[PDB]
Design a protein around this motif. Structure first.
Motif, PDB file in Angstrom:
ATOM      1  N   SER A 171      13.614  27.700  53.820  1.00 63.39           N
ATOM      2  CA  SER A 171      12.740  28.623  53.115  1.00 63.39           C
ATOM      3  C   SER A 171      12.119  28.018  51.865  1.00 63.39           C
TER       4      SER A 171
ATOM      5  N   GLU B 210      12.532  29.354  48.937  1.00 61.31           N
ATOM      6  CA  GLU B 210      13.628  29.374  47.993  1.00 61.31           C
ATOM      7  C   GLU B 210      14.517  28.125  48.132  1.00 61.31           C
TER       8      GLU B 210
ATOM      9  N   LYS C 270      13.042  25.397  46.261  1.00 57.65           N
ATOM     10  CA  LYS C 270      13.284  25.616  44.845  1.00 57.65           C
ATOM     11  C   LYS C 270      14.705  25.308  44.388  1.00 57.65           C
ATOM     12  N   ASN C 271      15.589  25.020  45.332  1.00 55.03           N
ATOM     13  CA  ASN C 271      16.986  24.673  45.096  1.00 55.03           C
ATOM     14  C   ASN C 271      17.249  23.185  45.389  1.00 55.03           C
TER      15      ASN C 271
ATOM     16  N   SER D 154      23.029  23.715  47.949  1.00 56.34           N
ATOM     17  CA  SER D 154      21.742  24.087  48.561  1.00 56.34           C
ATOM     18  C   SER D 154      21.568  23.471  49.945  1.00 56.34           C
TER      19      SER D 154
END
Lengths: 632, 632
Positions: free
Chosen positions: A84, A86, A89-90, A96
């Motif tokens: 994803s 997200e 973003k990790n 992650s």
């Protein structure tokens, strides 16, 4: 496919990658930017199903430079894999889905990469595996490509030369290697340390070599079309600018391994027509175009499934995907004195007969490692692989065989030369793949070849490496039980095997090989426990008999697998380990102090001499061991 | 030099080699027989002093295929080195001067060889070392060749490609590589696993390539004369018959690694005009001709000594031969918090300033390993070597720098990539040479790069390897004391260094770094001893302070070197190790159970995340360690 859409797609990849690295304040943005135009074009050629990353006939994509992970993750997200925004973003954050170098727990990642050179050898291995799959299942069912992106670091590593040697020999015309030639390494210009004629090098190894501008969409597309029709493994030398698009950082070695900086990224976005004040942006045209991989991939896999249904290979494929380890009748070695290289070779033959996907080979030591799979033929038509004197590439190639989908591979060499392949063994362990390592000639029992050929510290290395079982069987029966465990295990295993004949053991008294260590002899109120593995177990049995004749009650423990013993409960360990515990191994194995009060091992390098002379020199006799145990 | 004498000389070498192997009932006669004509001719070109094997300007001869030891030993005996006929009769026997693979304890052996490929990289290293020696001492004083004999196994190994890459880059026109192309390997015909265009491969790496019949004396001589005048490193591809002269075993892969047999040898002697019923025979003409190397060598060295006396380099050479380690003022790091990669880099700079022969480099990681020798220039004119992404060849090259006669080399990479160079590190250990290994980025403290880049098992490997010191300093002061020991030691050392900043320690309470472990904190009637190395020492100091606040008396031990601690007497160890001993290291280091009741380490692979997050994940906090020590 046109220049306007490709530029937008490439820049989308550039800015996802840059933004990911910047948010993490960690990582490698330069290569992603240098490679973004190539990947954008490659996306139109790659055949894959983002919603089924296990589709057997997918093209296999390998980033050998695992440092370029942000670009891979950007592409997987954009193409519709289960990764994803997200997750992006990790990047590089604890736990992650987007670790700093790619891991197979992230869906879509073909193989773990990071240590340079590995990925090139893995890609050669996927190409060999695909050729064997084509032999088994037919060209109607197996016809895909293997694309590998690599850099200068990969091509300087010895493992790359080894693997590419094999690619040319085996005429791997399914393999396309794309070399990011950006003139930079960590220490600055590549010419500080490298000036090979790369075209000539690869032509010497049987490749077709193309040379392009890696920022020209037309040249990339034309090179890929030509490479796909090659009758040879193909190298595309793609000249690129590291950090292409990033203004003052273009061409800078500093862009390799640190964030570009907020201002550099703003400027880069401005020059590309992107809004500099937003991050993780995916424009509409690029979003739709990249995500169309979903529909295209579903249709490609559907067409392939229809070919499978028409094939005469359905039952074979099902057996390969669902091996039955329980049915296998192993040899009965009870009471038979043998070298464990010989029991193991007989087991390898039973496994190859029972398992259509079981195969492997040695690094030019088949006759000594006892790994010939008799009457089962040579690769590609048969099962025996001749790796040559290429231990490291062998292991990296077999890591890829283990990931391909239908194979159970083994790699063989002398235990001392495990050190040549250890970095690739570590990748097997990291991934928890089913890849078996066969290491014969395990000790000073090698004899006359001398200390360069006599293992001392290698048992410690393999025991210390996580996610490995290290089996050192004392007889054929233990060797069989070790295989039964290894096939059912969730991690790779090594088999540490003798050159010289060992004595068959009597049956277990309490516990078995499944417990890692078990009792061969148990005495009430034992004063001593002698613990050993492999070739030293018989010495301990004989020594315990002498100690008993002298009035000392003894336990004797066989420990074919230290790692399994570590997992046993306290009650089990306490039953085994009575009185003063003495560990005995022809190795420098200080890890034995986890279980032993005293360790009787080898602390030096070995000696060139007859095996019996060398064992006596190093103290492996009943009289010497008993004197040690009696502290006088 | 003429055909009649050369044939007798070559056959003398063949039958000494065959007879040696036959008497031992062990060893490798095929290559000696295949190479005997080449060595006979080479004996007329080689410049060497059998009575002074340390003559600095001698040609360096390397047998990369150490399996051909019988031929080397035959040649050393015949040429007048300190190796007797009786020694030849003791081939492969315990404690003889003629072990199965060559060892430097045998005078005349340049470097230990055996593991394939190593010797080719060592020879490249001798050629680089000679170029640097020429830079320091002048072309009047350094002008010799480096001859390496190699085979198929050597050239398939990745390390050979890596080293030869560097040879072409550095225009090593003192290097002559002779490849025994005999069409055979252990698994049979070489074509089973290798079909490279070898000429093209080496031309791609900047070599001149000659191709000869290795049994034609005139062609060998002409090739050697041409090679000696080359402006490039030179490869001679010598086509030979394995077991040449041995009748039914000619061309047989079986002749590689087993005795020829008594009847085969009788027949071979008969065909060559030798008496079949005598062994270890040296005919007169050959005896005199081979032993004339003594007089010739004495005259060559005498002429060279006269050039040295006329040179302006006498005092420099004496400093290089007699380094003064005592005079060196190291940096004072007392009280200074630093990453030990940074303290170490400052030390490397002080050493390079004080020692004209101290030099080295990194495998393309200089900026991260902190190994730049500031303002000291690049090889060959300066001291900084740019090895490229070639860890294994780097270590094998530096093994040769350490053997050359005037150099103190260091090899640097990340500790995780020690695994790429481990086989060559092992040769350093076997030979007990002064070669320093610099390993930064020692733990999960690496952080975001993740588990492929986070060492776990490597400390165990280096501690288990004999004849190595493995230093893991907790601060700069320990780092300095470790170097002082390493320079005075008789074995190689590794330095295991942090990426991240560490806290400076207080002064020792009892013992010091020289003892391997010493006390930082000592309490009467200690209930616990916390033992750690490197980055974990501060955690133990802080944890001991908390335990003391909770009413538990503690010792804290810093253990910068496990191997040195193992050498201490019982009284010393018993003073340190009080109460329940807990070992604490960011490693899977079960060897700590030699000294500890409990070990608080890492048993898995690491994680990609910020360093502080990763250390917390793996339990390296005061609260967690104290809870562990208090068993609740």
């Amino acid at each position: 496919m046109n220049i306007q859409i490709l530029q937008e797609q490439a820049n989308t990849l550039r800015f996802l990658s840059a933004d990911m690295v910047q948010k993490a304040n960690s990582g490698h943005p330069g290569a992603p930017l240098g490679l973004a135009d190539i990947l954008s074009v490659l996306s139109y050629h790659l055949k894959h199903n983002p919603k089924n990353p296990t589709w057997l006939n997918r093209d296999r994509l390998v980033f050998s430079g695992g440092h370029a992970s942000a670009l891979l993750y950007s592409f997987l997200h954009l193409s519709g894999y289960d990764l994803s925004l997200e997750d992006l973003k990790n990047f590089r954050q604890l736990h992650s889905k987007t670790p700093g170098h790619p891991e197979i727990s992230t869906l879509g990642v073909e193989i773990a990469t990071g240590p340079l050179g590995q990925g090139v050898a893995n890609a050669v291995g996927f190409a060999m595996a695909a050729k064997k799959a084509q032999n088994l299942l037919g060209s109607d069912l197996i016809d895909h490509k293997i694309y590998c992106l690599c850099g200068d670091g990969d091509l300087q590593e010895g493992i790359s030369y080894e693997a590419c040697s094999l690619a040319g020999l085996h005429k791997l015309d399914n393999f396309i290697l794309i070399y990011d030639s950006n003139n930079i390494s960590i220490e600055g210009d590549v010419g500080l340390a490298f000036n090979e004629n790369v075209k000539m090098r690869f032509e010497a190894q049987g490749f077709e070599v193309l040379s392009i501008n890696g920022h020209d969409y037309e040249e990339i597309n034309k090179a890929l079309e030509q490479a796909k029709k090659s009758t040879k493994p193909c190298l595309i030398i793609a000249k690129t600018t590291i950090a292409k698009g990033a203004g003052e950082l273009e061409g800078s070695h500093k862009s390799h391994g640190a964030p570009l900086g907020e201002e550099v990224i703003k400027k880069a976005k401005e020059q590309a027509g992107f809004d500099p004040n937003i991050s993780f942006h995916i424009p509409q045209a690029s979003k739709i175009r990249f995500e169309s991989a979903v529909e295209l991939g579903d249709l490609e896999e559907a067409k392939w499934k229809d070919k499978l249904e028409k094939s005469a290979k359905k039952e074979l494929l099902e057996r390969l995907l669902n091996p039955d380890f329980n049915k296998i009748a192993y040899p009965d070695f009870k009471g038979k004195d043998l070298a464990t290289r010989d029991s193991n070779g007989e087991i390898l033959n039973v496994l190859a007969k029972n398992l259509e996907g079981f195969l492997g080979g040695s690094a030019d030591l088949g006759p000594s490692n006892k790994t010939e799979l008799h009457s089962m033929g040579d690769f590609v038509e048969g099962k025996n692989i001749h790796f040559g004197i290429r231990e490291h590439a062998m292991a990296a190639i077999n890591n890829a065989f283990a990931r391909y989908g239908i194979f159970l591979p083994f790699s063989a060499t002398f235990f001392i030369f495990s050190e040549y392949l250890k970095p690739a063994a570590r990748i097997a362990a990291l991934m928890k793949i089913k890849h078996f390592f066969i290491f014969t000639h395990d000790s000073i029992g090698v004899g006359e070849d001398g200390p360069t050929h006599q293992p001392i510290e290698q048992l410690s290395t393999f025991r210390a490496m996580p996610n490995f079982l290290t089996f050192r069987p004392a007889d054929g029966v233990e060797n069989v039980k070790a295989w039964q465990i290894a096939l059912n295990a969730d991690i790779p295993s090594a088999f540490v095997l003798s050159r010289q004949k060992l004595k068959a053991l009597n049956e277990p008294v309490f516990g078995d090989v499944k417990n890692g260590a078990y009792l061969l002899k148990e005495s009430k109120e034992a004063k001593f426990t002698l613990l050993a593995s492999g070739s030293e177990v018989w010495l301990c049995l004989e020594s315990a008999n002498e100690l008993e004749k002298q009035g000392f009650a003894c336990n004797v423990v066989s420990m074919p697998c230290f790692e399994l013993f570590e997992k046993q409960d306290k009650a089990y360990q306490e039953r085994l380990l009575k009185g003063e515990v003495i560990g005995v191994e022809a190795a420098h194995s200080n890890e034995l102090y986890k279980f032993c009060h005293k360790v009787y091992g080898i602390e030096s390098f070995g000696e060139s001499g007859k095996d019996k002379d060398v064992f006596e020199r190093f103290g492996f006799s009943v009289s010497k061991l008993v004197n040690f145990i009696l502290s006088k």
